[PDB]
Structure formats: C-alpha cells, structure tokens
C-alpha cells in the first residue's frame, strides 16, 4: 500500500551547498499468513558474499 512513489524534493539554500532528498512512504500487508512457507538452513558451499 503506497502513500506516494519515489519523489525528489529540493531543500533550502543555507550556504554554497546544493541539497536534495528522495522519499517514499508505504507498508506491505499480507492478509493470509497461512498461505506462505519458508525453508531454513539451506547449504552454501561457494565461498564469498554478494558484491557491495
């Protein structure tokens, strides 16, 4: 449920710096908790992690 999508909002000028921000509001809701499931503790063998 979205209140607004991503938007860019400029800020005031308090000096020789340019500022702006990005905002987004929302929340996910799952109506039926009994219709999902999860597998835990699955084996990993390839070394490393995902790149930053």
């Amino acid at each position: 449920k979205q209140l607004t999508p991503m938007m860019k909002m400029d800020l005031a000028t308090l000096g020789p710096v340019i500022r702006w921000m990005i905002l987004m509001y929302g929340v996910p809701v799952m109506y039926a908790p009994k219709k999902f499931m999860k597998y835990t503790n699955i084996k990993a063998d390839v070394p490393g992690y995902i790149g930053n």
């Binding site: 308090l14 000096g15 020789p16 710096v17």
Partner: protein, 52 residues
C-alpha cells in the same frame, strides 16, 4: 584712508556658498564599509556577516 580695503578679503570670497532653508541643517555620512574580520572561509562554509 589708513585702513584696509575690500581687496584684502580672501577667504570669504573663495568659500563656496549654498542656500539654507532652515535654522537647523542636516547631512549624512558613510563612515566605513565594514569591520576588520577575516575573508577566507573554506569549501562549502557559509561566510560571516558584516555591516557598514
């Protein structure tokens, strides 16, 4: 005649003359442009305020 004549008056004939419209006359002056502060600030730093 053993006294002075009109030709011995020097300053009174050279000072400029301006018309007066009141018994009290007013004028304004500009004493200075600012105070003795610093001018170097830095990158992205708001400079100091100054007054005349």
């Amino acid at each position: 005649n053993l006294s002075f004549t009109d030709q011995h008056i020097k300053f009174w004939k050279k000072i400029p003359k301006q018309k007066a419209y009141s018994t009290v006359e007013q004028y304004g002056q500009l004493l200075d442009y600012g105070r003795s502060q610093g001018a170097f600030v830095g990158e992205g730093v708001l400079p100091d305020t100054n007054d005349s």
